[PDB]
Amino acid sequence: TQLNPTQQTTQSAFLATTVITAQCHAILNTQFTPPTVKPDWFDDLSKKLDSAKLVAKQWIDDLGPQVSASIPSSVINFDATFQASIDAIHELYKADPTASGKDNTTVQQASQIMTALSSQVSGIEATVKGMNKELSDWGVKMQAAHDDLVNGATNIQKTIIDLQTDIESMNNAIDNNRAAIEKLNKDLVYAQVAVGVGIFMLVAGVALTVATAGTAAAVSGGIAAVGAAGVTWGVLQNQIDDDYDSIAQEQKQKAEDQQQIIALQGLSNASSAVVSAIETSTSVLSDFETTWTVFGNELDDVVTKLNNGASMQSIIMEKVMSDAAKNEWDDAVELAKQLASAKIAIETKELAPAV
Ligand SMILES: C[As](C)(=O)[O-]
């Protein structure tokens, strides 16, 4: 069975911010080690990686947990007043089911109940919008760091005239792998069934050189995918194998220092993935804001109707007052509670393509 509209935007928004977190961890799992003879460009490119890692940590340590928690708590924290409000309206109707007219006290109370509930929705709208603005601002900083890393690698790669053909091959495989991993994550974000509570993050370094992480001239690109009880470590290995198997063979033909230069775009695999995840999050956070805006305007419509002389009878038939809406809301709250307490596992490994 499928997610109802409020469930869908709740879950999608939350999973998308969880992908940002996963890819920030992937940035932190990106690394490279100088060759035995450290070249002119190493320190400056390393600083650019450090800058990307710094921005990643701001999300992991501060902004991320706050944005991600705001999505379910907006639903959870609205529940008590929403229920009491709808119950009060039902009770008003039961006591005076023919009440109509702006001077009728039942109408007046119903109007005041829905006006106050709408004012609460407007506050929630602003809260979500503010969160999406904080994400936006942070994402500008991450984009800057990403662009600087990309451009740094690109300029270095231009200066070694012999390797241009191998760099092209590596960067084709890198683009292929990025796209494949991105699809795994986007598929989850946009899934239309309940993900459950077994949500996890798979974070890998990917050897792009013969030299393993920590040894001279090594390059380790980062990848991450979110899944739930569908991503697996075996799936990630088969993709790495699919995309990089041939590059791993080619890299063995090259000197250690050369393999490193060929792999330098890998240092921004993780940050390109974070940039994509920022894109997706901004979109589904707008969808989530829209969930609240729609609801707010529905309540406003009830207020307008009452003030123009509508009967309570006409109001009790509206969508917001209906049994279906109550049951969808109740299901959205439950979904949101499960997300808010979900304990998201992080598993970290170092992977290499096949030989
Ligand atoms: C009451 As609602 C935010 O699920 O439309």
Residue numbers in the entry: 6 to 234, 240 to 365
Q: How did the manuscript describe this experimental structure?
A:
Here, we describe a cytotoxin of V. cholerae, MakA (motility associated killing factor A) that to our knowledge has not been previously reported. MakA functions as a potent virulence factor and we find it  is pathogenic to C. elegans and zebrafish. Our studies demonstrate that the MakA protein is secreted via the fT3SS of the bacterial flagellum thereby being the first described toxin of which we are aware that is exported by this route in V. cholerae. In this study, we identified a novel virulence factor of V. cholerae, the secreted MakA protein encoded by the mak operon, and demonstrated its role in lethal bacterial infections of C. elegans and zebrafish.
To analyze the structure of MakA, we generated crystals of the purified protein and performed X-ray diffraction studies. MakA can be described as a two-domain protein, a tail and a head. The tail consists of a bundle of five long helices (helix 1, 2, 3, 6, and 7). α1 ends in a short β-strand, β1. α2 is split in two parts, α2a and α2b, after a kink at W64. The head domain consists of helix 4 and 5 and three β-strands that together with the β1-strand of the tail domain forms a four-stranded sheet (strand order β1β3β2β4). Overall, the structure is well-defined except for three regions with disordered electron density: the first five residues from the N-terminus, the last four from the C-terminus and the loop connecting β3 with α5, (residues 235–239). Like MakA, HBL-B and NheA have their head subdomains turned upwards, packing against the tail helices. The FTPP motif in MakA is located on the short β1-strand and the loop that connects it to α2. Interestingly, F37 is not directly exposed but stacks with F47 in the beginning of α2. F47 is in turn stacking with the third residue of the motif, P39. Thus the motif is likely to be important for rigidifying the loop between β1 and α2.
